[PDB]
Amino acid sequence: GFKRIVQRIKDFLRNLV
Structure with a gap:
């Protein structure tokens, strides 16, 4: 959902951060 x-x-934040 x-x-x-x-x-x-x-x-993504794990990728960015």
Whole structure:
């Protein structure tokens, strides 16, 4: 759902941060 995808960004901040 919308929350499930939100988890995909966490991977982005993990990539950026």
